[PDB]
Amino acid sequence: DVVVRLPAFGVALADAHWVDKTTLLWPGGENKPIVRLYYSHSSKVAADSNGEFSDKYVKLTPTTVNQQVSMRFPHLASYPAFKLPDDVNVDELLQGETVAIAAESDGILSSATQVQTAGVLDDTYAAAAEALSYGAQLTDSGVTFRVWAPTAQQVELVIYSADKKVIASHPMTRDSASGAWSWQGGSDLKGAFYRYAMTVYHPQSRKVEQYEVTDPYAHSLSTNSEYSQVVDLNDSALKPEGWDGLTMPHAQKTKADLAKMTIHESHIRDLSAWDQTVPAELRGKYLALTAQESNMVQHLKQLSASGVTHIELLPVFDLATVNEFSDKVADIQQPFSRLCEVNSAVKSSEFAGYCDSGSTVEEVLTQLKQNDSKDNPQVQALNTLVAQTDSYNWGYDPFHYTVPEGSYATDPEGTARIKEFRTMIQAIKQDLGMNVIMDVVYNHTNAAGPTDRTSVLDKIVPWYYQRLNETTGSVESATCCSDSAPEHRMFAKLIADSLAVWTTDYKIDGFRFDLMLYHPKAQILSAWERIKALNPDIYFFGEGWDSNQSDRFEIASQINLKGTGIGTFSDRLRDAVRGGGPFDSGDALRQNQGVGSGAGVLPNELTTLSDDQARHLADLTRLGMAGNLADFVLIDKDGAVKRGSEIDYNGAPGGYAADPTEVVNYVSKHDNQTLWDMISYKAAQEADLDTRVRMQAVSLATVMLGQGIAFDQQGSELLRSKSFTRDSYDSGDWFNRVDYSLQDNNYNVGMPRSSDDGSNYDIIARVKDAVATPGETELKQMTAFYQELTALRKSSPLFTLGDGATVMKRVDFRNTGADQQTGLLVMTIDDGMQAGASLDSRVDGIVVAINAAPESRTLQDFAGTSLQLSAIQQAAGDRSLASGVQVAADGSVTLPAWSVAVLELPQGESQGAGLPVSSK
């Protein structure tokens, strides 16, 4: 056997992949005579002083990739394949560093690279490891700790006292079949803090690292997640009174049940950070939801009574971007002096002069408003510094997937947060009458590598839980941060086990997957199958659409999830009604008007939108109101008969769903500009304040009165503004403010962050002061419009049919084709004899008319049909979106500008003719 030696001829990159027991995929070994897999247990492979590689190695022989490997890693199927002998001691090699080396016949090195072992790890240990349970599993009879670390050389369980002093370090017992380590002790360990002391090779640093890491299956933590804690979530001491009997206020069993879902996407701080009627110690906490006397809680109670059915919570799992040690945090309601003591950047800034002042941070920000402008964005200048050390962040930064966030609890030390979180869930369901959905972020981790404080998974099993670049081994960042690998068996299991805890132990009713398309379709479905065993009515849905992982596996996208029952946010109606797209900047923000802001019918001074383009948006909007079904048949802008899949959406088929319950419509969400800020960017100069409020309502009407599940951002009913901020994840209490005292909508409170919106300062300055800023009058008006819409949505089962086939049999549209009155959306829902059975004993049909235009419009296609205005809208009088609507003798219906009318055909002795869907 020749000896590999030197003639930059050392280990470089990591483009070799050990995908299974005997297969090694590596481009560098092609056509090369000598292909080997060198390995070193405790050392870094490298040529010795003599220039030779004298470390142990295994001989690799050319081969052809097998079907099994090709299916698992399609993106690597083209790589030159090499086989290892069947007697290779895989386990021992995986305990240290392995490097693939290739050299010419003469033995002169041609290339050497590191090896990515995720594949062989799954092939060798996954099945055995999947059959076990992980974490500190405490029962009243004892505890069993288990952690998966197939490559670690040593793992010790370190037990800490409450004061964080080591009271014991136990070497764990490794299971050869699974590669998991365990340790069994007595129940006296209940409540104890612990960490796993790892001795493991990390490919990134190429060294056998030695560090203590928290449990990835942690179910309790110390302040700021420094230590994991042994806990039995079943303990009655961790449950509010009557917890076990908590039931879901809204059904989610049938598709009809699901269709009634009306979501209010909220954030723990956005809800109570500014509410002075919420006890001070509960502001920005889970428990604020229990302050029945507060403006915020009373507001949500009324929304629920009016038709909002679900509260969706932005990250409430353990996020990493907020320091849980209160002494290290300063918020705007506190003295500027406090800010200076915890934030050295502020103390060294142009604002240092405020340090020894007697002002609070918010008082300073308030005074900076008058002289704030595009040329002097001082409000955001100060806020950007405040953001570094405040209590604010959306939290899409996973630290621990199965422990509640600590900063939202009154006491982040230990188990305390568990009961408070549950108390909140109970309050929402029991006292506010709404189901709860949790935003989950399994698509990435906050960090990876062997050094970052928040790198947990990548420290315990390096290069396994993260998705890596095929050539460099670098952790990918397409998600934003440290991309995870849901396609790997043990991470898929971690996800499913995690969801099981939130479902069973925290009684969560549904989960919204962040960037769900970075997950394999099969993995999402498998997780749903597992969770349905715990809660048969659990609902799964998600978003993303920037995919790019299709080369590795079939992704969980809108298209691929058709007919599966897994929901996806639809960006079709969203874009059509809001106008433009999320990538717009500068003038495009104003030019790209939407149906909700007058596309075509009320053009601003910059837009070039044609009537045809405006009508195309109307096609996308109507399709969306019908559940954005692939097979829904409608008449398009040109009078052509088209299926939803035939309506174009920027190059892709518009309609993609099988059932409306697989589609979540919306016109505002936590990310991107608020609906009001978009209307402010797009509205024509002549559109006055009152008109803009109606535009907000008309925009929301397309969602609320549609067949798809309805979703909306907390505060849309209050014309919520972020002062034009596009991405407010770290913009603090200032820009994310929601005022439940109803004084204003937080519009015009300073130019938004320059780093992300600086390119929009020009357009902002030009449109910002077009009209007055909303006040109590406008907020109360909008809340009334909003509650009317949600009340209408639940006023009849016809609005939420659930089944795609039923929608196709009952839903149709009028005012379509080339001779249509632009901006007028007229949707009919049949309940007559031709539709089948009467689902609503009070009506034979319903007509939804949304006049998104500055003209009054008259409908003549319902003449002699005895159409009547909804009792709900009649009851609202001149405060209704239907104020001014006229139902004449001849049967014609006239709608005022920017109005919404829900009309019905009263049912007589028997089911009537209704509004049959026309043959197309």
Ligand X SMILES: OC[C@H]1O[C@H](O)[C@H](O)[C@@H](O)[C@@H]1O
Catalytic residue set: 514, 543
Cα 136-140-145 angle, rounded to 5 deg:
15
x/- contact string, 558-587, with Ca ion (CB under 5 A)? ------------------------------
The binder of 397, among Ca ion, ligand X, none, by C-beta within 5 to 8 A per type, is ligand X
Least distance CB 680 / ligand X (angstroms): 21
Region of 2-10, 394-402, 773-781, 872-880 interacting with ligand X (CB under 6 A): 394-402
The binder of 636, among ligand X, Ca ion, none, by C-beta within 5 to 8 A per type, is none
Please tell me the distance from the alpha carbon of residue 678 to that of residue 665, in angstroms, as a whole number.
17
* 397 binds ligand X, rule: CB under 6 A: yes
Please tell me the distance from the alpha carbon of residue 489 to that of residue 148, in angstroms, as a whole number.
12
Nearer to ligand X, 394 or 401 (CB): 394
Region of 174-182, 380-388, 611-619, 822-830 interacting with Ca ion (CB under 5 A): 380-388
Region of 154-162, 583-591, 619-627, 902-910 interacting with Ca ion (CB under 5 A): 902-910
Least distance CB 845 / Ca ion (angstroms): 8
Within a 10 A sphere around the Cβ of 715, how many other Cβ atoms?
A: 28
Integer angstrom CA distances of residue 89 from 39, 95, 148: 11, 10, 20
Residue nearest Ca ion (C-beta atom): 838
The binder of 543, among Ca ion, ligand X, none, by C-beta within 5 to 8 A per type, is none
Query: Cβ distance 700 to 306 under 8 Å?
Result: no
Per-residue H/E/C for 792-823: HHCCCHHHHCCCHHHHHHHEEEECCCCCCCCC
Nearer to Ca ion, 580 or 750 (CB): 750
Please tell me the distance from the alpha carbon of residue 407 to that of residue 392, in angstroms, as a whole number.
9
* 392 binds Ca ion, rule: CB under 5 A: yes
* 452 binds ligand X, rule: CB under 6 A: no
* 729 binds Ca ion, rule: CB under 5 A: no
Please tell me the distance from the alpha carbon of residue 448 to that of residue 51, in angstroms, as a whole number.
34
Query: Cβ distance 753 to 380 under 8 Å?
Result: yes
Reported for 272-277, long-range contacts at CB under 8 A and 24+ positions apart, including other chains, are 272/296, 273/392, 273/733, 273/736, 273/737, 274/733, 274/737, 274/738, 274/739, 274/740, 275/740, 275/741, 276/741, 277/740, 277/741
Nearer to Ca ion, 321 or 851 (CB): 321
Size of the site for ligand X (CB under 6 A): 8
Least distance CB 523 / Ca ion (angstroms): 17
Token duo for residue 366: 């308030």
The binder of 387, among ligand X, Ca ion, none, by C-beta within 5 to 8 A per type, is Ca ion
* 730 binds Ca ion, rule: CB under 5 A: yes
Cα dihedral: 657, 658, 660, 664 (round 10): -30
Nearer to ligand X, 250 or 512 (CB): 512
539-542 and 567-569: which strand pairing? parallel
The binder of 480, among ligand X, Ca ion, none, by C-beta within 5 to 8 A per type, is ligand X
The binder of 840, among ligand X, Ca ion, none, by C-beta within 5 to 8 A per type, is Ca ion
Nearer to ligand X, 394 or 518 (CB): 394
x/- contact string, 394-433, with Ca ion (CB under 5 A)? ------------x---------------------------
The binder of 838, among Ca ion, ligand X, none, by C-beta within 5 to 8 A per type, is Ca ion
Least distance CB 391 / Ca ion (angstroms): 7
Query: Cβ distance 500 to 520 under 8 Å?
Result: no
- Interaction residues for ligand X, span 188-227 (CB under 6 A): none
Nearer to ligand X, 755 or 919 (CB): 755
Nearer to ligand X, 736 or 815 (CB): 736
The binder of 831, among Ca ion, ligand X, none, by C-beta within 5 to 8 A per type, is Ca ion
Region of 150-158, 283-291, 389-397, 815-823 interacting with ligand X (CB under 6 A): 389-397
Least distance CB 225 / ligand X (angstroms): 16
After which residues, if any, is the chain broken (C to N > 2.5 Å)? 7
The only residue of 367, 754, 838, 892 in contact with Ca ion, by rule CB under 5 A: 838
398-404 and 262-266: which strand pairing? unpaired
Nearer to ligand X, 114 or 482 (CB): 482
The binder of 318, among ligand X, Ca ion, none, by C-beta within 5 to 8 A per type, is Ca ion
Least distance CB 319 / Ca ion (angstroms): 5
* 480 binds ligand X, rule: CB under 6 A: yes
- Cα Rg, the chain, nearest whole Å: 30
Residue spans of alpha helices (H) in 827-910: 871-876
Q: Which residues pair with 633 in a beta bridge?
A: 643
Region of 79-87, 205-213, 736-744, 839-847 interacting with Ca ion (CB under 5 A): 839-847
Region of 107-115, 201-209, 389-397, 677-685 interacting with Ca ion (CB under 5 A): 389-397
* 518 binds ligand X, rule: CB under 6 A: no
Least distance CB 439 / ligand X (angstroms): 11
Q: Which residue has the tokens 């097979």?
A: 631
Residue 167, SS3 per DSSP: strand
The binder of 671, among Ca ion, ligand X, none, by C-beta within 5 to 8 A per type, is ligand X
Question: Residue 353: CB partners within 8 Å, gap ≥ 6?
Answer: none
Q: What is the enclosing helix (H) or strand (E) of 213?
A: strand 207-213
Q: Which residue has the tokens 């849309």?
A: 716
Nearer to ligand X, 449 or 603 (CB): 449
Question: Residue 31: CB partners within 8 Å, gap ≥ 6?
Answer: none
x/- contact string, 794-833, with Ca ion (CB under 5 A)? -------------------------------------x--
Least distance CB 907 / Ca ion (angstroms): 5
Least distance CB 527 / ligand X (angstroms): 22
Region of 71-79, 393-401, 628-636, 653-661 interacting with ligand X (CB under 6 A): 393-401
Query: Cβ distance 863 to 890 under 8 Å?
Result: yes
The binder of 727, among ligand X, Ca ion, none, by C-beta within 5 to 8 A per type, is ligand X
- Interaction residues for ligand X, span 668-727 (CB under 6 A): 671, 727
The binder of 729, among ligand X, Ca ion, none, by C-beta within 5 to 8 A per type, is ligand X
Least distance CB 671 / ligand X (angstroms): 6
Distance of CA 144 to the CA centre of its chain: 34
Size of the site for Ca ion (CB under 5 A): 12
Region of 130-138, 355-363, 386-394, 674-682 interacting with Ca ion (CB under 5 A): 386-394
Query: Cβ distance 669 to 728 under 8 Å?
Result: no
Of 789, 844, 815, nearest in space to 306 by CA: 789
* 734 binds ligand X, rule: CB under 6 A: no
The only residue of 217, 506, 729, 785 in contact with ligand X, by rule CB under 6 A: 729
Integer angstrom CA distances of residue 410 from 223, 229, 590: 11, 18, 44
Cα 206-208-214 angle, rounded to 5 deg:
110
Please tell me the distance from the alpha carbon of residue 724 to that of residue 74, in angstroms, as a whole number.
43
Length of the chain: 920
Cα dihedral: 719, 720, 726, 731 (round 10): 170
Please tell me the distance from the alpha carbon of residue 729 to that of residue 394, in angstroms, as a whole number.
5
* Interface contacts to ligand X, rule CB under 6 A: 394, 396-397, 480-481, 671, 727, 729
* Interface contacts to Ca ion, rule CB under 5 A: 318-319, 387, 390, 392-393, 406, 730, 831, 838, 840, 907
